[PDB]
Nucleic acid binder design. Structure first.
Lengths: 207, 82, 86, 79
RNA sequence: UAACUGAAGAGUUUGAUCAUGGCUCAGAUUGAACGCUGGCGGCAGGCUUAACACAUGCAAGUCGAGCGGGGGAAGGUAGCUUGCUACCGGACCUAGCGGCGGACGGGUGAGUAAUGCUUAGGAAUCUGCCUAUUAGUGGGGGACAACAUCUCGAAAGGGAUGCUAAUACCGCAUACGUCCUACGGGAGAAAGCAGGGGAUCUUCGGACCUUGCGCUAAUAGAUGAGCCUAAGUCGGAUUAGCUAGUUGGUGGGGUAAAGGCCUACCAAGGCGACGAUCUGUAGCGGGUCUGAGAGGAUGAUCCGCCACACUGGGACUGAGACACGGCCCAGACUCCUACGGGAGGCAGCAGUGGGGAAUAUUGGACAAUGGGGGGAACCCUGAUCCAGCCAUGCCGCGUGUGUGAAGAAGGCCUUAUGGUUGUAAAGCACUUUAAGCGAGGAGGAGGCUACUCUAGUUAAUACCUAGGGAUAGUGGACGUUACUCGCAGAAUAAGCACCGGCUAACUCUGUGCCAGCAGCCGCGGUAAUACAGAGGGUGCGAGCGUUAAUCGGAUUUACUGGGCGUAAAGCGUGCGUAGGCGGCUUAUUAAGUCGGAUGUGAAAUCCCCGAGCUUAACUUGGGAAUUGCAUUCGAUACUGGUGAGCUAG
């Protein structure tokens, strides 16, 4: 399954911008209702919360930003726990190594939903083959490119234009002329935003 | 008698065979005396296609084991490859 | 039986049983004669009976009616019992 | 290269046979305390050299009767 | 490099409190079932209950190069109503005798607490087909199916007389090995068929040479099976004595082989509180689930062993059976009949009735891996490979994307005009995964035949065997395969539970201790955040809930790891049997204890590093592990044994 419907209410409930919108207009002007929950009993962020509520709301934010459902997320956490290192670090690397996320951060998609649509419709080739699974893990050194049929597409041009305004990641080497990029390494925690607190998710799944 | 033959493993429509030495009266995938190699008809990339232990093969042949047709062909192939 | 080959096997079975029973009876009769001579106790008579009995035992053992180990046991024990008669 | 056991004769009434008691000390599987376990073996005595109370040695062999499969090797100590 | 690293609590007894102690809840798991809902793919799973009764089809045949007959097609020759007849040699087919196979493969867990299973050892055995080596295959005879005749029976099938072939059967001869032996000696086998051929002969069609496949006697190997020992393997004492072939010995019999396995005598033994006997339950293991571990539960799918084949008792044939689809006997049940006479056993595959909460098609092919027969061609194979049905489980994908607000309408709450549904919708601009249509298209097939050459064995270039070369034919159930490329359009696709506390998520109407809810604590008797509907929201998502069951939480049987003054719990008090434990010094032993080495601990499964599947599930290479068992070599502090000594008990 895959979430389809209103997007901004998710951000309003979470309390922050989860960038499901393209970004041409700021979140505040786009919603006019941020700082309030989307229910008929909508309140401000100053309401008290329990530890269970904090843990649940932390994991939900990561799930909504990355578009991942509960079963796959639990499988990811089990894999990260099995692998050596910091569990939250491994989980974030696994989430960032997804193909659709790589397409979004490489700029051919305005949003992760658009990138996922492209990947599903086989407009993106990994190495030299036309894949269609958005959950594929991209490994160091892989080459991502846009299919020649998918080139000269207006949505792709707009996406790269918006990506140019957005900050280019350090770990991705992308040329927009032929629309091709190279992955080199998993982003590190300092590379990732510091808003996300992986310790809450680890505590939740450890329970 | 004692025979050398293939035992079918793997998954549906992608077979993988173990080359075993066994009494002929046993079931195809059951009791056996010794495993001496493998055959993967659909290998690609870095996957090995055929591995056979020539020394044990010759030992059992000398003791009187009877290779099957396909195993004899595979032994000829491995000897040519080596 | 259900099949033709099973019926044929049954027919062959009964015929072979009759033939084998005849030969086995032969062996038993000769052994019994030798035992009777031994119980009689004359040395020469027992020796003659044993000399008659040995070839029949050997022939049936070679045909497979009895095992060759059985034949050897019979020969050895009968020879011992005859020799004891001095 | 033959299996031998050492024990104490507890009977010699039957003809050409002795009953020898073997003793071993093993640990309890769960509680770990060493406990004493004993078994009775029928052995073969051709010349009735063994008596009650002696310490003897037996060795495994082919069956001699329904319950005898051991033969006396030597008498270590006489009662 | 690595092969692990692992332990959470809450509610409830009282006007408060602390303790004790039950009960209930939060987790993981499933061969599950039921309710609501439902798009696709991959890989697995699918009568747990009646070892209940079974309609119908299939699941074991093959060899004419072992044998005699018997068939019906083509031909060729001669006659002539002229394309019809009469004969003759080749090509095919098989009811019967005979060989091999049918003891494998497949199903099930009734019985079985030990004749079974697991681990470690042993000696007194047999072993078709296979491998190596040695000695041979000489010469005769009497039968019996088919066939012919008779007869019973509607038949199915029976019975009686007369013939015949063989690699069917039995004498005689011979014997490198082999058996017995008194050490002198004695005893015992076999069968032919096919391919090719120079020379010679042909008593007239073969002899003779040679090569294959056979057959006989023997020794090793391998494989398979039988036999023995030790340790381990669930409850009950409201089951304490059990056993006369019983325990041992001798002579004899019997077996492939040890043995009371059997028998005639002699003796009085044998087992038991370390649980005999009796009784209840149960296939065992590798493993699976849970647990921090120790433990607990379990033995579907995969592998090993055992047992059974409608219920009991037997044996025959055979290398091997006391034989699922063989025979005899007894029993119960069912079927045909023309009343003469007969037939049967799905716990094989598919299927039917019945039972049940509940579990599928009366499908395709031997193309692949195997099994049986054959020299080969080839035939058989419900094993197997595939296909059909089912959200039963696990994994993956989709049900569209961006923009879009003086915030449309409608719904709901209200402090009565705002808030919320909400960028949500409409509108604008795009995209074609999956499904549908069209076109191409791997791999699962190594081989075989035809041709040519080489090397062997031969008298030979012939035959046969083993290799090399290139070319051409030939061979796929799945299957319209996987996969790739085009075609039209957002076009075909979202539900389920919950919102008082445990526990994430609140308001309004309706009803009034009624209707109802409920895992526990508890709600409802007019303003119900707990009943019913609605709005809103939360959690999951092709699923979501409920019931059932196991472990956990439970230190709530406590070995790790609990208690007994008053909470449950010290026998009314002594003495004493088996048992448990036991002062100090010294020498010796090496049973306990500890260390090394060797053998073993099947594969699969779990864990680690890799590989191949577009990813993942899944498949797979190599390791690590299997904490155990046995043998042997060492150590001597402690415990035990033996010898000596001492006085604090």
């Amino acid at each position: 399954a895959r979430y389809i419907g209103p997007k901004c209410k998710l951000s309003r409930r979470e309390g922050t911008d989860l960038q499901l919108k393209s970004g041409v207009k700021p979140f505040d002007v786009k919603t006019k209702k941020a700082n309030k929950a989307p229910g008929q009993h909508g309140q401000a962020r100053g309401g008290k919360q329990s530890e269970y509520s904090l843990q649940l709301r932390e994991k939900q934010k990561v799930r909504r930003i990355y578009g991942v459902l509960e079963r796959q997320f639990s499988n990811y956490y089990k894999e990260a726990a099995r692998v050596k290192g910091a569990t939250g670090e491994n989980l974030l690397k696994l989430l960032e190594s997804r193909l659709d996320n790589v397409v979004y951060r490489m700029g051919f998609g305005s949003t992760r939903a658009e990138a996922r649509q492209l990947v599903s419709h086989r407009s993106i080739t990994l190495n030299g083959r036309r894949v269609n699974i958005a959950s594929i893990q991209v490994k160091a050194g892989d080459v991502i490119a846009v299919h020649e049929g998918a080139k000269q597409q207006l949505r792709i041009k707009n996406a790269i234009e918006l990506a140019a305004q957005r900050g280019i990641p350090a770990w991705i080497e992308v040329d927009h002329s032929k629309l091709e990029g190279t992955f080199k390494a998993a982003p590190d925690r300092s590379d990732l935003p510091a808003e996300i607190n992986e310790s809450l998710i680890v505590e939740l799944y450890s329970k | 008698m004692v025979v050398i033959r293939l035992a079918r493993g793997g998954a549906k429509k992608r077979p993988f065979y173990q080359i075993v030495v066994t009494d002929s009266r046993n079931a195809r995938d059951g009791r056996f005396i010794e495993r001496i190699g493998f055959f993967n008809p659909t290998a690609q990339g870095q996957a090995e296609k055929l591995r056979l232990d020539a020394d044990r093969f010759a030992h059992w042949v000398s003791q009187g084991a009877q290779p099957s047709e396909r195993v004899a062909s595979l032994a000829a192939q491995a000897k040519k490859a080596t | 039986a259900n099949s033709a080959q099973a019926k044929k096997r049954a027919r062959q079975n009964v015929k072979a049983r009759k033939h084998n029973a005849s030969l086995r009876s032969m062996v038993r009769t000769y052994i019994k004669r030798t035992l009777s001579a031994i119980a009689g106790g004359d040395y020469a008579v027992a020796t003659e009976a044993y000399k008659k009995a040995v070839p029949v035992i050997d022939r049936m053992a070679d045909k497979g009616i009895i095992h060759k180990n059985k034949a050897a046991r019979h020969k050895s024990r009968l020879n011992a019992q005859v020799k004891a008669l001095a | 290269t033959v299996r031998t056991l050492t024990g104490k004769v507890v009977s010699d009434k039957m003809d050409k046979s002795i009953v020898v008691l073997i003793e071993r000390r093993v640990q309890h599987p769960l509680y770990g305390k060493s406990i004493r376990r004993s078994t009775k073996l029928h052995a073969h005595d051709e010349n009735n050299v063994a008596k009650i109370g002696d310490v003897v040695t037996i060795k495994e062999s082919r069956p001699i009767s329904k319950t005898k499969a051991w033969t006396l090797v030597e008498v270590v100590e006489a009662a």
